[PDB]
Enzyme design. Structure first.
Site, mmCIF file in Angstrom:
data_model
loop_
_atom_site.group_PDB
_atom_site.id
_atom_site.type_symbol
_atom_site.label_atom_id
_atom_site.label_comp_id
_atom_site.label_asym_id
_atom_site.label_seq_id
_atom_site.Cartn_x
_atom_site.Cartn_y
_atom_site.Cartn_z
ATOM 1 N N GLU A 11 -16.126 13.487 0.475
ATOM 2 C CA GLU A 11 -16.330 13.489 -0.964
ATOM 3 C C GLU A 11 -15.088 13.165 -1.795
ATOM 4 O OE1 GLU A 11 -20.426 14.516 -0.949
ATOM 5 O OE2 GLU A 11 -18.953 13.614 -2.297
ATOM 6 N N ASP A 20 -20.569 9.185 -9.352
ATOM 7 C CA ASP A 20 -20.723 9.132 -7.885
ATOM 8 C C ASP A 20 -21.250 7.752 -7.479
ATOM 9 O OD1 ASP A 20 -23.704 11.244 -7.267
ATOM 10 O OD2 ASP A 20 -23.418 9.343 -8.239
ATOM 11 N N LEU A 32 -22.086 17.562 -8.285
ATOM 12 C CA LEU A 32 -22.966 16.826 -9.214
ATOM 13 C C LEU A 32 -23.142 17.576 -10.557
ATOM 14 C CD1 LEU A 32 -24.955 14.545 -9.944
ATOM 15 C CD2 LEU A 32 -26.766 16.007 -9.099
ATOM 16 N N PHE A 104 -25.568 19.002 1.669
ATOM 17 C CA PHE A 104 -24.653 18.988 0.522
ATOM 18 C C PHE A 104 -24.789 17.703 -0.295
ATOM 19 C CE2 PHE A 104 -20.612 20.633 -1.313
ATOM 20 C CZ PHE A 104 -20.079 19.512 -1.937
ATOM 21 N N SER A 117 -36.422 12.800 12.646
ATOM 22 C CA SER A 117 -35.068 12.985 13.125
ATOM 23 C C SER A 117 -34.839 14.461 13.392
ATOM 24 C CB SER A 117 -34.076 12.596 12.049
ATOM 25 O OG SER A 117 -34.225 11.257 11.607
ATOM 26 N N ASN A 132 -32.875 6.960 14.797
ATOM 27 C CA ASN A 132 -33.831 7.257 13.714
ATOM 28 C C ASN A 132 -33.147 7.575 12.359
ATOM 29 O OD1 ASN A 132 -35.835 9.489 12.189
ATOM 30 N ND2 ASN A 132 -36.972 7.844 13.192
#
Ligand SMILES: [Cl-]
Ligand SMILES: [Cl-]
Length: 162
Positions: A11, A20, A32, A104, A117, A132
């Site tokens: 990040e 972002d 965010l 996250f 998955s 996948n």
């Protein structure tokens, strides 16, 4: 390496409001603020998050505090979700970190959406699950980060981050 250092690599850290990858207003370590287009709605959310008038900029300490809360929320979200919890319970420590990372970034809802998955991870079919996971908008939009997470699930080591 641990979840915090991993997410910090992915990040990065910025002390002033930024956009972002999706173009949403964010601050700190991937925090965010709003999906709204308004810089003002952004600044207001920020002030409410910090407990102070800030005018768009925060300190390192404020950033790390939002970061601690967000990681804690991420884990609690997984533990409370009926689809995610069994997966998490089933995994080793390294791979657990990889699921936290995905949550996250995309939220509990999103990750919960990777039904196949997730079934593959529970079954410990590493290579099949990696394949996948790559057939997703996620992988297409943030390929370098996606590859790192994927490699973590395939191998169960931290090599992609070393
Ligand atoms: Cl908050
Ligand atoms: Cl990327």
């Amino acid at each position: 390496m641990n979840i915090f250092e991993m997410l910090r690599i992915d990040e990065g850290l910025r002390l002033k409001i930024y956009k972002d990858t999706e173009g949403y207003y964010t601050i700190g370590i991937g925090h965010l603020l709003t999906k709204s287009p308004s810089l003002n709605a952004a600044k207001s959310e920020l002030a409410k998050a910090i407990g102070r008038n800030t005018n768009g900029v925060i300190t390192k300490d404020e950033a790390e505090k939002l970061f601690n809360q967000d990681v804690d929320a991420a884990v609690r979200g997984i533990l409370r979700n009926a689809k995610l919890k069994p997966v998490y319970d089933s995994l080793d420590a390294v791979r657990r970190a990889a699921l936290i990372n995905m949550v996250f970034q995309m939220g509990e809802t999103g990750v919960a959406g990777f039904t196949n998955s997730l079934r593959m991870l529970q079954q410990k079919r590493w290579d099949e699950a990696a394949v996948n996971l790559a057939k997703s908008r996620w992988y297409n939009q943030t390929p370098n980060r996606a590859k790192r997470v994927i490699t973590t699930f395939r191998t169960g080591t931290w090599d992609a981050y070393k």
